[PDB]
Ligand binder design. Structure first.
Ligand code: OXL
Ligand code: OXL
Ligand code: OXL
Ligand code: OXL
Ligand code: MG
Ligand code: MG
Ligand code: MG
Ligand code: MG
Lengths: 259, 263, 263, 261
């Protein structure tokens, strides 16, 4: 583990990259010995910096869930990152393309917590008990590091950039979350489809997993937090002028336009 | 009734207007005493020309259904027009904006006929018996006459093949007896925002009614609605302008969706 | 921001306009530099007067939801107004046409609160948690300022208590988690004919959204949405003029109906 | 256009590539002037040769459906190929891995025809009228050409990458449920590798069947009663390796499984 000052330095470079819309060199190429522990430390530092700047923690995401599951990927488990208030866009919003560098849209479910969730022994059942509503959610992911590597993604707040909630809120017991499915349209054509079971076999699993990862840091998932569980589609690039419409069937839809 | 030659020449000017994407003056201003029968005669001549050029009749539309019903509108009954093969786009198509003048999208249901329908006494029941499937349909409408003289009337619309330009089918095909057609409803999004919503009962109290009306209108001309034709029943939303770069997505709930992009 | 005294006097003129059923000139024409905050201040003063006369606050409405969403409209966000006890009519009422100036009917859903809602960070989820029942609601809207100067702006509407005049509740009360509120749909009949149709998602993509927005708007004024209040979420149809002798019947399908007659 | 005897020579090379499980150079590289018409002519010849050897035509498939839709791909419309009887494996079967070169599994719906479909004006509604049953279907695809935009000519010539078909799950009448929302989870060796929803196939998985009838009409060919028509995959293909077990869960449409040996 690098010393605190190195983590802060890396975080400040990611911050400037995000604000300037100018990518930096992959952190792992400049810091060949970086570990996963370092990457989460850098993330913590960046998030700390951004909250100091006037942002507020609103929740967390779990990512690389598809890659953790795929036999072909060397990724062995999910990543996580922190969701801040300024990342949220309303359903039907115009999204400022110029804010982002290489934005892509992916399709998720979100858990809105009525009660806190704390590890180390958090289960799926705890998640069900603590969840007020499940709601469809799009994630807008981005990269502050050049991709000419998991350590780079994690350092870079797990690729976080935007979240768009919409559709129909449901109580968790209302229907089988595993069979929620979606069609992602971009510019009028279906680009990806998927089913929620594709997220770790049950889209609530990542929420328990996450609570358990945060416990050693004396961190819990707080009541009121929104937790994105992971994408069940591949991400699709968003370019200026693109309209997205994601149809979750009887769970409603989420749309936006890049301007 | 003007002579056949006058009908043919008005038809030719509409045809050139469409081909050139350049509007003509409202027919009703150049011909102040034009009748409804003249307007349909001009339409018949234009469709004749188009078919002579190699186009094929695929069905018909019923239009001005909302206005026929609205008390604030002087329109007393629907109009109709002919749908040709080159008007049809598949769900999820890029539509060439340059092909059109002032295109607008509206939200309809279509009836695909298994059997022919002939007037003069066609009923809603006949329509049910003859219909193979009901399917969501968008209509792309346009205007080859100026709307404000450099306003248009019903005679201009009817002459102008009832504003026909495009049709986009999509969604879930259903047998007519599968659910209550009156309560099919839709949300019309453009560029990610809902611009209009509507329910199918807004078309003449039952979206199948215009099909019987249409078969009855065509009966005097020794024309029927043929097996295999697609009949668009009328829009249950107001039309929404389509501009280059616009994406539309029309969500018919459990009846599926229809989308396209103007390029 | 004009002084309190100016706000009070504009409020008094609206009040007289309502009492006399005689419109005043558009406030926005007499006060060319009026701000949104001025307009809400005038509304606050008018509601204060009305409550001092013996009226009681029963809830609020969110308005201009369609226009806030429509790309062709310069309105960037909804408005709001205060609902008073004397605005409410029961389902199946005779409504005195003479009480109003240019009344119009529109089609909404209402949220009956079990618990209070306070901003600044109210979400859709908070609205669900606080809502006791959702119920169909018609709004009767009116205008105490002239629409064409012998046009009105948003400042006139907002000052004019957001065009509030009447509310008519009816139909089936449901718990918010009972069905998808987005797909509640309605047919608005007047005199036996369907004049408008609509679907509830046409209100801000989800009819509960305006309730959170409203709680957030009121938070700076140290005002919250109280337990027991009725909150009208915005119309999903265009408004339809109401004239003496008109019957309305608004069919919300499996959510019931609301009807009335203007006498 | 190449002369017909060149179509025949290309088809013979593909036939040998398949038999020896050894890829040939991309046809589009060996034959730079190749047209889509040539590609389908090569396919027709190869299918004729296989039938002459004792195979029987059992149906057709429509492919490249995702690529035709996706903006990131220059492919403009789907392709099609012929399904022969020796391509079909039973639900729960061992599949001989050694018979294939670079096999991959994908997830489809199939339409079992009660009545023939003939173009050139075939519609989705004609497909519904002509379909006896819709049934889940896996396709096993493969490539007899090595892959170092005109690649489409190679895929088409190579019988649209056809190799195998595995039918299973629940047979339904076409009006039973909305086919657009049929969904599936593709497991390989116990883990979900892909998921997808059938509307990913041309916005309605029946659409390609009408398009296919219309493509075949100029050749005096129709889709015949009794044929099985695979509509196109709504998942990306997943490599199949010796030892692999696949289990594809279509929810209330049942499942299809197989094992590579
Ligand atoms: O990485 C992610 O954000 C994901 O997989 O959803
Ligand atoms: O005029 C029309 O086409 C209509 O109302 O649908
Ligand atoms: O302005 C209003 O009252 C509305 O939109 O419902
Ligand atoms: O090419 C294929 O076979 C497909 O897309 O299903
Ligand atoms: Mg994600
Ligand atoms: Mg129409
Ligand atoms: Mg209202
Ligand atoms: Mg295939």
């Amino acid at each position: 583990m690098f010393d605190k000052h190195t983590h802060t330095l890396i975080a400040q470079r990611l911050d400037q990259a995000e604000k300037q819309r100018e990518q930096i060199r992959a952190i792992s190429l400049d810091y060949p010995e970086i570990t996963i522990e370092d990457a989460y430390a850098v993330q913590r530092e960046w998030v700390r910096l951004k909250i100091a700047e006037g942002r507020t923690l609103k929740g967390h995401k779990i990512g690389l869930t598809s890659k953790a599951m795929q036999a072909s990927s060397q990724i062995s488990e999910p990543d996580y990152g922190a969701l801040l208030d300024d990342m949220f866009f309303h359903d039907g919003s115009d999204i400022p393309t110029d804010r982002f560098i290489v934005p892509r849209i992916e399709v998720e479910l979100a858990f809105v917590l009525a009660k806190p969730l704390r590890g180390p022994n958090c289960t799926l059942f705890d998640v069900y008990n603590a969840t007020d509503y499940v709601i469809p959610a799009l994630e807008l992911i981005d990269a502050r590091c050049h991709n000419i590597k998991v350590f780079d993604t994690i350092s870079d707040n797990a690729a976080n950039a935007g979240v768009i909630l919409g559709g129909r809120p449901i109580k968790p017991d209302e229907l089988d979350l595993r069979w929620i499915s979606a069609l992602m349209y971009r510019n009028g054509v279906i680009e990806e489809t998927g089913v929620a079971a594709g997220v770790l076999n049950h889209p609530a699993n990542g929420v328990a997993w996450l609570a358990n990862k945060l416990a050693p840091y004396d961190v819990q998932l707080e009541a009121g937090q929104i937790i994105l569980g992971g994408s069940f589609t591949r991400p699709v690039p968003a370019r200026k002028g693109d309209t997205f419409h994601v149809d979750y069937g009887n769970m409603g839809s989420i749309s936006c336009r890049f301007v």
